Symmetry: C2
Subunit: 220 residues, 2 copies
C-alpha cells in the first residue's frame, strides 16, 4: 500500500471518450508526490481538438496522491488498495446540460501509477457551455466529501464543481463517486480539498493541457 | 405484514429431502397463533419410513409465528416480510457426523402460511446417531440468536440443538441461518426461546410426527 507512495511516483493516464457521438482520446504523463500531495501532468488530445472543454475532463482525468496527514493515516482508502488497485465509477451531471459517466481502473504498472478511463457523455446541448466551448481555462479549489460504504468494501464521494464561463456565469457539475478495490481499508467521513492550475506547453502543437495539483485530506 | 398474524393462521409445510442419497418427502398441515406463539402441526412421511430421525427435521421443518411482545414490535423481521415472504437458508453440522443444507420459501398462499423446503444431507455415518436412528423422540428448549445483517436486507441467526440419544449421550447440531425477503424491517440482537413437544397420532398408520411449539422473543 502506502509503502509505495513515499517519494515521487511517475504517472500515466489514459482516457477513452465519446460525448454525443464525438469520440476522442487523451493520454497523460507526469508524476505525483503523495507525501506533499503534488501532481504535475501533461495531457495530449491524440484524436485532434477536443469536442469538449478541457476543464470538464479534469476530475475524470489519482486521488491516491492526496497528502493524508499522519493523524489521518487510518483513512487513506486509495493507497490501501495499492498496488492491486481500485475502480472509480462516476456520474457527473452538468446543470441545465448533459451528463458524463466514467469508469476507470487505477493500478500500478511497474513503477508508474496508471489511470485507464472510459467516458460516455449524453444529452448535451450545442451552444451550451460544454459543446459550445464557453468555459474559462480555469479550475477553482473544491472539497471532495468521502464516506465509506461498508457493504461494497469501499467508499463513496460526492461534490460539485464550479466551472467559470466566459459569460461571467458559472457552470455547475454534480459529481457522484463509487470506489471499489481490485487487504482492506475504510475511512470515516472526511474530505479532500484540492487546488488546480491549468496551463499550456508553448512548444506543444497538439491540443493539450498541462495540469498542476495539490491535494490534502482533512476534517477529523 | 403482522396485520396478517392477529388470530389463527392455518399452515402447510412441505419438505423435499435427500440425505446420503436417501430421498424422502414430508408434508405438514396445522395452524399457528402468533399472538400467543403456538404451533400445532402433523407431519407425514409420504415416501415411507424416514431415512433420518424425526427430531433432526424439526428445525428445518415458520418463526414468523413467534410471539413478539409489544415492547419488541420493531424487531419482528419475519412478520414484516409478509405476505410476500422470505427465504431461509441453513447449514447444520451434526457433531462428529454429517451435515444438512436447507433452502426454503415461506409465503402466504390464500389464507395459509406455506413453508416449501429443500434439504440435502451429506457425509453421514451409519451406526451414527442420525442414519442409525439413535435419537430420543424429544426436543428440548433452545434459544435462537438473531442479528440483522444490514447489507443483505435481512437477518442472520445461529444456535446449536441438543438432541438426546438413546445411549444417554447428546447429539449436537450447530445451526447457521440466513434470512432474506421476497417494505422492510430489521431487528436489534435478540433471541427466540422455544419449547417443543413431539408426539404421535395413534390412529395414524404412516410414518408421521405431531408437533406442538410455543415460541417467544426476548432480550431487549
Amino acid at each position: 500500500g502506502e509503502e509505495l507512495f513515499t517519494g515521487v511516483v511517475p504517472i500515466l493516464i489514459e482516457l477513452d471518450g465519446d460525448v454525443n457521438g464525438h469520440k476522442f482520446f487523451v493520454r497523460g504523463e507526469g508524476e505525483g508526490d503523495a507525501t506533499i500531495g503534488k501532481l504535475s501532468l501533461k495531457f495530449i488530445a491524440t484524436t485532434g481538438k477536443l469536442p469538449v472543454p478541457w476543464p470538464t475532463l479534469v476530475t475524470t482525468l489519482v486521488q491516491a496522491f492526496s497528502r493524508y496527514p499522519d493523524h489521518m493515516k487510518r483513512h487513506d482508502f486509495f493507497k490501501s488498495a495499492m498496488p492491486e488497485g481500485y475502480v472509480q465509477e462516476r456520474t457527473i451531471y452538468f446543470k441545465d446540460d448533459g451528463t458524463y459517466k466514467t469508469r476507470a481502473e487505477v493500478k500500478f504498472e511497474g513503477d508508474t501509477l496508471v489511470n485507464r478511463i472510459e467516458l460516455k457523455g449524453i444529452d448535451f446541448k450545442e451552444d451550451g457551455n460544454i459543446l459550445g466551448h464557453k468555459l474559462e481555462y480555469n479550475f477553482n479549489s473544491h472539497k471532495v466529501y468521502i464516506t465509506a460504504d461498508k457493504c461494497n468494501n469501499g467508499i463513496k464521494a460526492n461534490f460539485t464543481i464550479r466551472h467559470n464561463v466566459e459569460d461571467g456565469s458559472v457552470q455547475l457539475a454534480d459529481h457522484y463517486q463509487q470506489n471499489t478495490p481490485i487487504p482492506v481499508d475504510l475511512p470515516d467521513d472526511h474530505y479532500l480539498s484540492t487546488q488546480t492550475i491549468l496551463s499550456k506547453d508553448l512548444n506543444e502543437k497538439r491540443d493539450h493541457m498541462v495540469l498542476l495539483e495539490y491535494v490534502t485530506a482533512a476534517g477529523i
